[PDB]
Write an enzyme that holds these catalytic residues in place. Sequence first.
Site, PDB file in Angstrom:
ATOM      1  N   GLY A  69       0.864  -1.281  -0.208  1.00  0.00           N
ATOM      2  CA  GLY A  69      -0.569   0.274  -0.166  1.00  0.00           C
ATOM      3  C   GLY A  69       0.519   1.606  -0.066  1.00  0.00           C
ATOM      4  O   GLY A  69       2.305   1.193  -0.337  1.00  0.00           O
TER       5      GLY A  69
ATOM      6  N   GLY B 297       4.258   0.991   1.706  1.00  0.00           N
ATOM      7  CA  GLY B 297       4.969   0.143   1.413  1.00  0.00           C
ATOM      8  C   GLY B 297       4.813  -1.129   1.035  1.00  0.00           C
ATOM      9  O   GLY B 297       3.973  -1.703   0.072  1.00  0.00           O
ATOM     10  N   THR B 298       5.531  -2.324   1.785  1.00  0.00           N
ATOM     11  CA  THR B 298       5.297  -3.766   1.645  1.00  0.00           C
ATOM     12  C   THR B 298       5.465  -4.740   1.990  1.00  0.00           C
ATOM     13  O   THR B 298       6.500  -4.216   3.122  1.00  0.00           O
ATOM     14  CB  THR B 298       6.003  -3.907   0.493  1.00  0.00           C
ATOM     15  OG1 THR B 298       7.336  -4.631   0.137  1.00  0.00           O
ATOM     16  CG2 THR B 298       5.909  -3.642  -0.881  1.00  0.00           C
TER      17      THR B 298
ATOM     18  N   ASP C  84      -4.516   5.096  15.424  1.00  0.00           N
ATOM     19  CA  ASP C  84      -4.396   4.983  14.445  1.00  0.00           C
ATOM     20  C   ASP C  84      -5.033   3.256  14.848  1.00  0.00           C
ATOM     21  O   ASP C  84      -5.076   2.489  14.190  1.00  0.00           O
ATOM     22  CB  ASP C  84      -3.612   4.286  13.175  1.00  0.00           C
ATOM     23  CG  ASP C  84      -3.752   4.091  12.157  1.00  0.00           C
ATOM     24  OD1 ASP C  84      -5.212   4.858  11.462  1.00  0.00           O
ATOM     25  OD2 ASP C  84      -3.160   4.206  10.887  1.00  0.00           O
TER      26      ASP C  84
END
Lengths: 263, 261
Positions: free
Chosen positions: A18, A21-22, A127
Amino acid sequence: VYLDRKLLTLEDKELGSGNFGTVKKGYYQMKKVVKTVAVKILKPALKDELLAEANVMQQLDNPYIVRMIGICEAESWMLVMEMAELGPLNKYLQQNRHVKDKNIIELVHQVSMGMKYLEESNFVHRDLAARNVLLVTQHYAKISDFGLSKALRADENYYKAQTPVKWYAPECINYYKFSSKSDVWSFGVLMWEAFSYGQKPYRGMKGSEVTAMLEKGERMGCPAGCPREMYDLMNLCWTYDVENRPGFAAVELRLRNYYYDVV
Amino acid sequence: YLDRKLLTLEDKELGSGNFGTVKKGYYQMKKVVKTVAVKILKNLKDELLAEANVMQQLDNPYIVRMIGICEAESWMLVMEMAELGPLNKYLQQNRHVKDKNIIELVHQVSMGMKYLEESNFVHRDLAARNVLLVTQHYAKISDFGLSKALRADENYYKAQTKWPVKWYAPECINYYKFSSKSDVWSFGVLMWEAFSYGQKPYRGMKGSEVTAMLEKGERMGCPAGCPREMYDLMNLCWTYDVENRPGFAAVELRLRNYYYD
Ligand SMILES: CO[C@@H]1CN(Cc2cn(-c3ccnc(Nc4ccc5c(c4)c(C(=O)C4CC4)cn5CCF)n3)nc2C)C[C@@H]1O
Ligand SMILES: CO[C@@H]1CN(Cc2cn(-c3ccnc(Nc4ccc5c(c4)c(C(=O)C4CC4)cn5CCF)n3)nc2C)C[C@@H]1O
C-alpha cells in the site's frame, strides 16, 4: 536493535502492499531456531517515520501488541516483526462470516487488554482500527501499526498535532488533541467494525457528513447479531465529551466481565 | 408511548432532585441511534404527561425537543440530549467564557422565548438552570413542567396559590398572574445569572426580603465585568409595571443589535 541482513530471508511473493510500502513473510535466524517474521519494507520522511515506529514498538512489551524483532538497513529500510499469520482482522472477518459472537468478544477484549497496557504506558495509538488488528490465530489478536503512535510527555495527557476521520474522536478533528480517550473512541469504531465482520463504518458518507452526524448526537446503529451489551459499550466509547468518556481500564473490565459471563 | 426496548440508559446519573433523576441514554430511531436525556420519575405522573403535552406543541431550534414518554419500570420523559447541561453549572466551571460568548447564548434564549411568546405559551420557570447547552455556542430552553398555554381571550395565566420567587415578577407574587411579560422579568434574572457565571441571584436574602427590596425600587447590581448595555437591558426587563415592561420582541431585538456590534 539493528538486525543482520545475512540472517534475514524474505519470501518472493508479498503478503500485501500500500501507500506505506510492502509487507513480506520472512525468516530470521536467532539463537538456535529460525523465527517466522513479517517485514514492512519501504519503497525522505518515511525513513524517519519507520524509525519512530520502531522506537515505539521497542518500548512495548505485551501479549496483545505485535512484537518487533528489529530494524534492518540494507538495500531498503525494513521493520522486522513477529509474524501474526492470519493477517488483518477486517479482511479475516470479511472472509469468515461464520466466526461466532463469543469469538469476536474474545478478540476485542484482547484488543482492550493491549490498549489498557498502552494507556498505562502513556502511549497514544492514533490509528486504532480493525485493519490494524492482526490475528495470530482465530482466538488471538494483536494490535499493530504504530506509525502514528506518540509517547505522551511526562507533563501532559494528550498529544497536540500542529495541522482516518471516521475513526477520530471529535476533539481530534476540532482541537487536534489526541489522548488515550480518543483511542477509546476509535476502539468503539473498531468494535463496530468487528461485530460487522469487517464492513467499513459510516458507509457512503464523507468526513464532514460524519462530523455533522456526531454533532447532532447521532451514532451508528447496532450491527446485525451484535450482543446488546457490546453495542451499549460502543456507545459509551462514543461519548462526546472527553472527560465523561471511559478510559481503557473501564472498557477492558466491562469486556472482561461480559466475556466471562458468556463463557 | 415509546418502546422501552429501543432505549438504553447509562447507570450513572447526570443529576437528581425532587422531580426524579436525569440519565443519559441512547434511543434507536429510524436508522441512527439518538443520544437522549431522560427525566425519570421515582415511584407527579400527570405533571410529567402535561410537560410532554407542552413540549409536543413546540418546534424551535432554541427549545429542547421531546422524543416521547416511555412507561416501563418508571415513567420517563425522553428528550434530545443537550450534552453540556445546565447553563449556570457550566459557567461556574468555565470562568474563561467571554462576555461576547455569554451574549450569544442569552440572545439565543431570547429567540426561543420570542417563539414561545408568539405561540402564546408562558414558561413560568425561566432561569439559568433551565437553559441547557448543546455546545458552548448553542443554548436551548428546557423544563416546561410549569408552562401553560394561554387562553384565547387573555394574555395571562392565573395561578391558584413551589415557586422560584427570586425569578418571579411582582405581579406573579402579588396577583398570581403569569404572562410573557413575567417571563421577561425572569429573563432579566437569567441574564444577571449568566453574566455572573452562574451565581445565585439575591445571595443571602430571604424571599420576603427580595420582594421588599423590589417594592422599594432597588435592583441587583451590575455583575463584575458585565457590559453596560447588558446590565441596562436587565433593568428594563425588571420594569415593575407590566404594561411598560418590554416583550421578547424588543428584548431579542436589542440583544441582536448589541451582538451585531
Ligand atoms: C491492514 O493493515 C496492514 C498492516 N500494516 C502493515 C503491517 C503489517 N504488519 C504485520 C506484523 C506482523 N504480522 C503481520 N502478518 C500478516 C499476515 C498476513 C497478511 C498481512 C500481514 C497482510 C498486510 O499487512 C497487508 C495489508 C498490507 C496481508 N496479509 C495476508 C492476509 F490478508 N503483519 N505490520 C505492519 C506495520 C499496514 C496495512 O494496512
Ligand atoms: C438544572 O436544571 C435541571 C434540568 N431539569 C431537569 C431536565 C434536564 N433535561 C435535559 C434535557 C435535554 N438535555 C439535557 N442534558 C443534560 C446534560 C448534562 C447534565 C444534565 C442535563 C444535568 C441535570 O439535568 C441535573 C440537574 C439535574 C446534569 N448534567 C451534567 C452536567 F451538569 N437535560 N430536561 C429536564 C426536565 C431540572 C433541573 O432544574
